[PDB]
Amino acid sequence: QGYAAEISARRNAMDNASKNAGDMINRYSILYNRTRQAVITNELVDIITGASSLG
């Protein structure tokens, strides 16, 4: 009887874990954008600064 109570709790434990971990993914995935865009803009700045070189 106390085995049927563990599975029941463990079924709830991993349910919220998937919800938190899952929702955590929708948060880091946003940080992956701003960080992707940052690298694209930064690499672009050196390219422009190397060409804007005059006297």
């Binding site: 434990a13 919220n16 874990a17 938190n20 971990a21 955590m24 700045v45 050196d46 600064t49 070189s53």
Partner: protein, 472 residues
């Protein structure tokens, strides 16, 4: 015969002046232009060649016409120094802006001056009690030392200083110099009210502090020099008077920010992030002048702005090295409701040594860090699984940790209009014993809420009892 010239170009806060005479004014010199509104002051930056020079406007350049006549001053922008500046609001240029008559000072020194010799350097390891728990316990400030208050926007850098002035400037005994660099013009006015009410600055009587402002509303040239103006005044009381002085600066970042706006027009090749190539030097010459020498001691509380909450930014990242104490505020802590939002981990000082704050103080502090650290290292686990998955030993450290964090908060008398709770000043002696008692596990029964925005450790048990009657 006054040396005279004509304007050849006017781009933003950068005006190019040309002189017919074969005598050219050196660099860092001042210039003046006649206008209906008043007089516009210029500052030499570099000799472009061909008897042409490049200068930086000190005010709006609207109306300037090409070829207009320009008069030379003959010396770098100077500002009145001496006890006569006290209780007076001086402008970046060095003229009264409080409408109370001209500052009849004895001497007038230039804002530009070379940093103290290596042999003139004097080191000290004396503690300075502020009353702030998260500080006097973790990263205590030193007398005549350099203080830094990093943090993003709206984290608590000024409000933090205001409290320091409400607790040190009063019981100080020396002189003070407040200089608002690129800050809300409104905060300056309200600051003036406070100095008058508190009596620090008495119009009819005497005063204990001088007010120099180069607010953000002012153009870049000013936001760049204002810091130098305020500093010149304070280095006077240091060498000439040889008396303890408190130098309050806010915000120091504007100094480099204002210089990065013009670096482009000056014809400099932008370094990474857009900042001017000579960031390290300029910032260098400034910090090296703000220090204690064998003639006098000066305690400086400089606030630093953190762009996009990025500590890796070249601006703030080059500021840490010029500080004996660093108190960083993370917006991730202020949002929790914890104030001041001091981050115990990142916060460092040079006084955090057992050969100064005592052996016990060293041990108690360390224990607090380890505990807070262990909570952070399991933070990932907490959001995913929870505390149910945490071990018995780990679960006990979390709660204890969370208790220590909340306890770090402290009601600020200056921020009473925000918290609605009367200020709480805690002594260093009691703070140490307090945490030490929490580490020993003598308050694991008391609820966490009782640690939130609490002053003295006695107030914790008091507040815990009040919560018993409120429970229904």
């Amino acid at each position: 015969t006054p040396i005279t010239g004509k304007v050849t170009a006017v781009i933003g806060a950068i005006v190019d002046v040309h002189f017919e005479q074969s005598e050219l004014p050196a660099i860092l010199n001042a210039l003046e232009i006649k206008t209906p509104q008043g007089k516009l002051v210029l500052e030499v930056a570099q000799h472009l060649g061909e008897n042409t020079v490049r200068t930086i406007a000190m005010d709006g350049t609207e109306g300037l016409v090409r070829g207009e006549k320009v008069l030379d001053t003959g010396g770098p922008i100077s500002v009145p120094v001496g006890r006569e500046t006290l209780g007076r609001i001086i402008n970046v240029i060095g003229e009264p802006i409080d409408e109370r008559g001209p500052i009849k000072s004895k001497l007038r020194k230039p804002i530009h001056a070379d940093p103290p010799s290596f042999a003139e350097q004097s080191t000290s390891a004396e503690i300075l009690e502020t009353g702030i728990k998260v500080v006097d316990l973790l990263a205590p400030y030193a007398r005549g030392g350099k203080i830094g208050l990093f943090g993003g926007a709206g984290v608590g850098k000024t409000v933090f200083i205001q409290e320091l002035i409400n607790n040190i400037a009063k019981a100080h005994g020396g002189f003070s110099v407040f200089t608002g660099v690129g800050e809300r013009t409104r905060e300056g006015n309200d600051l003036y009210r406070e100095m008058k009410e508190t009596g620090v600055i008495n119009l009819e009587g005497e005063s204990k502090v001088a007010l120099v402002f180069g607010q953000m509303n002012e153009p870049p040239g000013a936001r760049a020099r204002v810091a130098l103006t305020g500093l010149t005044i304070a280095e006077y009381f240091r060498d000439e008077e040889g008396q303890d002085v408190l130098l309050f600066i806010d915000n120091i970042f504007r100094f480099t920010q204002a210089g990065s706006e013009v670096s482009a027009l000056l014809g400099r090749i932008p370094s990474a992030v857009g900042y001017q190539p000579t960031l390290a030097t300029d910032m260098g010459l400034l910090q090296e002048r703000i220090t204690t020498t064998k003639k006098g001691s000066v305690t400086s509380v400089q606030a630093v702005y953190v762009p996009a909450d990025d500590l890796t930014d070249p601006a703030p990242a080059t500021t840490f090295a010029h500080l004996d104490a660093t108190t960083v505020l993370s917006r991730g802590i202020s949002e929790l409701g914890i104030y001041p939002a001091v981050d115990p981990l990142d916060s460092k000082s040079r006084l955090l040594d057992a050969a100064v704050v005592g052996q016990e103080h060293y041990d108690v502090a360390s224990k607090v860090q380890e505990t807070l650290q262990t909570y952070k290292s399991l933070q990932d686990i907490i959001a995913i699984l929870g505390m149910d998955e945490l071990s018995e030993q780990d679960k006990l450290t979390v709660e204890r940790a969370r208790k220590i964090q909340r306890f770090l908060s402290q009601p600020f008398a200056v921020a009473e209009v925000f918290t609605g709770i009367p200020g709480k000043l805690v002594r260093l002696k009691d703070t140490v014993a307090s945490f030490k008692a929490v580490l020993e596990g003598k308050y694991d029964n008391i609820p966490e809420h009782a640690f939130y925005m609490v002053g003295g450790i006695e107030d914790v048990v008091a507040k815990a009892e009040k919560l018993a009657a409120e429970a229904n």
